[PDB]
Amino acid sequence: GRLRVVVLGSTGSIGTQALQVIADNPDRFEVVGLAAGGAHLDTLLRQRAQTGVTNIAVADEHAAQRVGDIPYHGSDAATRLVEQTEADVVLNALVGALGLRPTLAALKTGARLALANKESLVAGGSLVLRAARPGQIVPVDSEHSALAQCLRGGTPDEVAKLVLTASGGPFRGWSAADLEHVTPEQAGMGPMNTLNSASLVNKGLEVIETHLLFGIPYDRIDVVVHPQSIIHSMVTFIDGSTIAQASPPDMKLPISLALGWPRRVSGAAAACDFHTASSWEFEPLDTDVFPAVELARQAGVAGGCMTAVYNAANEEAAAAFLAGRIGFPAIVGIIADVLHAADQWAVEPATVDDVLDAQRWARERAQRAVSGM
């Protein structure tokens, strides 16, 4: 009665926490596949020995060579592993839009896709949705996990609004002028999600992720700043009732629920402790200073390949910021500049190649924007 789990991005934060959840629950879960990029071979070798899984994908050819005997190696390794491994659940914890092909392959096998890699859904859009049956994608992202639990509070016709909470990042309350001086070390889960959290681009991706997972119109997806990150998101129903999910921050909770959906996993995470005092605070997002969420809505409403453009433009601008080439406020400046030139990408993708064409265009246009700074 064990679920067979493929873990993509096994050596990262989410991947190792997932392996820990699986280790703690041998009656429910069994690891049958691992994929990693090759930057952390030490961790990967330990994972092979501990799980006893030799069914492994390594993206970097040289790193795979150095290990020896890796059955899937090279840029398509993770995808081929998914295509050729019998599984009940695929956990996609890869980072970036490179998770796109493994997401599509996972869905095509019929397995539950436990999705941490929000970018593959954001980029893929209707192409990823067409590949999925209803409920096949189960969110690992903490907010979306919370939304899915809260939606149990009523029927679909009773949903008024979905309320996505945001930490606000380290620069919550900072002025536009304050942001000009943000260093990479200040804006630094992995380096991409840490940065995306600080810039609010993560929240923008999550608005798009919300629309795609739950089919709710953009004008019914609210974002509220909640610095404590105890409330992970909420749903407001048509009678005025709001149902919210709360827990001390710990990704093992949403990971555990996504792997075993619909069944909750005993002891996954610590519960809220109401025997000590606390406060849960809410404030509006300053959209003038942090316009990334609004840009995401604009990209989402345009639809088609525009969400792929939004993400791809961020990936390049973020890389440039982390390399010390542009200032912090330039990240979202570049995204806006790219999106506003992106007329032709409103068309719905027919194939993966359409998405890849949009991203290719977006990366080039982002470089052009960087070149002008």
Which amino acid would we find at residue 284?
Answer: P
Please provide the size of the chain in residues. 373
Instruction: Tell me: cis bond preceding 262? Omega within 30 of 0 counts.
Output: yes
Euclidean distance between CA atoms 354 and 348, whole angstroms: 8
Q: Looking at beta carbons only, is 15 or 204 nearer to ligand NDP?
A: 15
366 binds ligand NDP per the rule CB under 6 A: no
13 binds ligand 34F per the rule CB under 6 A: no
97 binds ligand NDP per the rule CB under 6 A: no
167 binds ligand 34F per the rule CB under 6 A: yes
Q: Following DSSP, what letter does each residue of 149-207 receive, concatenated?
A: HHGGGS-GGGEEEEEEEE---TTTT--HHHHTT--TTTT---HHHHHHHHHTHHHHHHH
Q: Following DSSP, what letter does each residue of 9-44 receive, concatenated?
A: STTSHHHHHHHHHHHT-TTTEEEEEEEE-SS-HHHH
190 binds ligand NDP per the rule CB under 6 A: yes
Structure tokens at 230: 């105890």
Stretch that binds ligand 34F, among 3-11, 56-64, 136-144, 268-276 (CB under 6 A): 136-144
Residues 6+ apart with CB under 8 A from 363: 312, 313, 315, 316
Stretch that binds ligand NDP, among 117-125, 232-240, 266-274, 311-319 (CB under 6 A): 117-125
Q: Which residue has the tokens 């392959």?
A: 105
Cα 88 to the center of its chain, rounded Å? 21
The closest of 289, 284, 287 to 297, measured between CA atoms, is 287
For ligand 34F, the binding residue among 16, 85, 92, 142 (CB under 6 A) is 142
Q: Looking at beta carbons only, is 55 or 197 nearer to Mn ion?
A: 197
For a copy of itself, the binding residue among 67, 269, 319, 341 (CB under 8 A) is 269
Give how many residues touch a copy of itself by CB under 8 A: 51
For a copy of itself, the binding residue among 134, 284, 324, 372 (CB under 8 A) is 284
Q: Looking at beta carbons only, is 265 or 305 nearer to a copy of itself?
A: 265
For a copy of itself, the binding residue among 27, 156, 274, 288 (CB under 8 A) is 274
Euclidean distance between CA atoms 18 and 11, whole angstroms: 10
Angle, CA 318 vertex, CA 126 and CA 123 arms, to 5°: 5
249 binds ligand 34F per the rule CB under 6 A: yes
337 binds, among ligand 34F, Mn ion, ligand NDP, none (CB under 5 to 8 A by kind): none
Q: Which residues lie near ligand 34F (CB under 6 A)?
A: 141-143, 166-167, 169, 193, 197, 202-203, 229, 249
Contacting positions for a copy of itself (CB under 8 A): 149-150, 152-155, 158, 160-161, 163, 222, 224, 234, 236-248, 250, 253, 256-257, 263-272, 274-284
